[PDB]
Amino acid sequence: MVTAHFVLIHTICHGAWIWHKLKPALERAGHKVTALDMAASGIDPRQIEQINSFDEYSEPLLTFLEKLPQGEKVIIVGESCAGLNIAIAADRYVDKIAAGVFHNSLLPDTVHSPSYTVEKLLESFPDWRDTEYFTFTNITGETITTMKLGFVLLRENLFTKCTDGEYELAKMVMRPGSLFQNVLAQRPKFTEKGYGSIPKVYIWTDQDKIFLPDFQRWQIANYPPDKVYQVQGGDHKLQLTKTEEVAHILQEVADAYA
Amino acid sequence: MVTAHFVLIHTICHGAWIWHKLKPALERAGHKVTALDMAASGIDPRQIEQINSFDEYSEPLLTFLEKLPQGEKVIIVGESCAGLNIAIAADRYVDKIAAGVFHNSLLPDTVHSPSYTVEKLLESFPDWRDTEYFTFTNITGETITTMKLGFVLLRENLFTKCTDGEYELAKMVMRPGSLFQNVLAQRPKFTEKGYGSIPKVYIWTDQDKIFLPDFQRWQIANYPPDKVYQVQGGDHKLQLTKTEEVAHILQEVADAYA
């Protein structure tokens, strides 16, 4: 069992900051941790309107993996929508990914369109409350739907059991984001040789108020992960409300695959 | 109990996020709170290289105050270098500022150059450790010194007694910033009619490891504030390490001036 290199990927609208409690926790256990901002997220200098696909949105991760020296492997950890980022990354860089970890995350598959898990998320959770929507046109003329996440949604559905301070942090650094759903829908399927071949660990809680239990159980059924860790209690942001438990799970992921 | 409107201004390199613990604390006491990102700070879309002065850097605050309805007054609260922001704001909008609060802050005066307190800060604390410096050229050809704050400096001097998680947050969302020192040096002195005339409350601790005790006592001597509140312990980021104490002090500021 080797100390691992965890790469932490936030969901859309969010940024590396979401991982502020979890990073030091992992580091305390001797692990190396990188927490990247995806495009137009966190303090990344770009604006969402100049991003054209989910693949572009994933560039910082892809550029990170490109630069990683031969023979070293990371464990990619992804929250909410970042399951897509993992899938995208593993197709490009399978030989550098020891395992993919899904944290109340979309779990894309190889058999359906890349947008499939997103169609389902939205089917299960159609009403995003006070969230506002805008559109822009991407470089090939697709109409992209972006979102500014509603403060009530943040409070009640995403950061349900977090500290008032964590919720306040979120409102202070939340940014517009997008699922690039129609562009995903036209994307090639994720490959078996790459994404398909990586170990997959699925961490979740039934107390999640946006990625609902039915949906998450459906995801597990539709594409069985190699390990499922169900966490009691908390909320959608386990890395805030159950930081120490998640750190411990990731220990086990490292022992298993790193 | 008086209820006030606090406007919270972070130091350079930082952002409104620095106030995540203190905002809800004040709101719990029934107060209204606005925490603004200054230019090229936090999640403000601009880059530091497109900002030319400290006055520009202050635009968000100035715009905020411009929009504030007649007869409404705020208490501006400023940390570290944000004392400058207060001075700048009070010269423009004295009739909307009930009081200025200085939180381990630069306390500019009316008698010297605006850069005076900065010359002194740097005199007292010349070695910014692993901080890296870059330059760019502003709209009138002044060579501007920007800084990426060092991670050791963050740890040991700025966030000395904060949680590992708060320190990790800082590294995740810290941005380049600048004192615009040479441009401050050429700026008109702060006025008596505006900045001079506002109540000033100076909050600090002698456990601060960047704004050192000799410097802070010197600042109090050089321009006596209307009230000085010395907080035992903590560190430079009192709003993280002594959140509740600071909230309470601000209550007293509200009762006195709001």
Swiss-Prot record, chains A, B:
Chain's role: Involved in cyanogenesis, the release of HCN from cyanogenic glycosides in injured tissues; the release of toxic HCN is believed to play a central role in the defense mechanism of plants against herbivores and microbial attack. Decomposes a variety of cyanohydrins (alpha-hydroxynitriles) into HCN and the corresponding aldehydes or ketones; two natural substrates are 2-hydroxy-2-methylpropanenitrile (acetone cyanohydrin) and 2-hydroxy-2-methylbutanenitrile (2-butanone cyanohydrin), but in vitro can also act on 2-hydroxy-2-methylpentanenitrile (2-pentanone cyanohydrin) and mandelonitrile.
Quaternary structure, from the entry: Homotetramer.
UniProt effect for mutating residue 81 to A: No change in catalytic activity and substrate affinity
Source superkingdom: Eukaryota
Annotated consequence of substituting residue 208 to A: 80% decrease in catalytic activity
List of catalytic residues: 80, 236
Binding site for acetone: 11, 80-81
Origin species: Manihot esculenta
EC number: 4.1.2.47
PANTHER family: AB HYDROLASE-1 DOMAIN-CONTAINING PROTEIN, METHYLESTERASE FAMILY MEMBER
Pfam families: Abhydrolase_1 (PF00561)
Gene Ontology MF term list: aliphatic (S)-hydroxynitrile lyase activity; aromatic (S)-hydroxynitrile lyase activity
Name of the featured protein: (S)-hydroxynitrile lyase
Practical uses of the protein: This enzyme can be used as a biocatalyst for stereoselective synthesis of a wide array of (S)-cyanohydrins by addition of HCN to aldehydes or ketones. Optically active cyanohydrins are interesting intermediates for the synthesis of alpha-hydroxy acids, alpha-hydroxy ketones, or beta-ethanolamines, all of which are important building blocks in organic synthesis.
Name of the top EC class for this enzyme: lyase
Reactions performed catalytically: a monosubstituted aliphatic (S)-hydroxynitrile = an aldehyde + hydrogen cyanide; a disubstituted aliphatic (S)-hydroxynitrile = a ketone + hydrogen cyanide; an aromatic (S)-hydroxynitrile = an aromatic aldehyde + hydrogen cyanide; 2-hydroxy-2-methylpropanenitrile = acetone + hydrogen cyanide
Family indicated by similarity: Belongs to the AB hydrolase superfamily. Hydroxynitrile lyase family.
pH dependence text: Exact pH optimum pH is difficult to determine due to the fact that acetone cyanohydrin is very unstable above pH 6.5 but HNL activity was found to rise from pH 3.5 to pH 5.4. The pH of the cell sap of damages cassava leaves was found to be 5.3.
Occurrences of domain AB hydrolase-1 (ranges): 5-242
Keywords: Lyase
UniProt keyword annotation of Lyase present: yes
Binding-site positions, 2-hydroxy-2-methylpropanenitrile: 11, 80
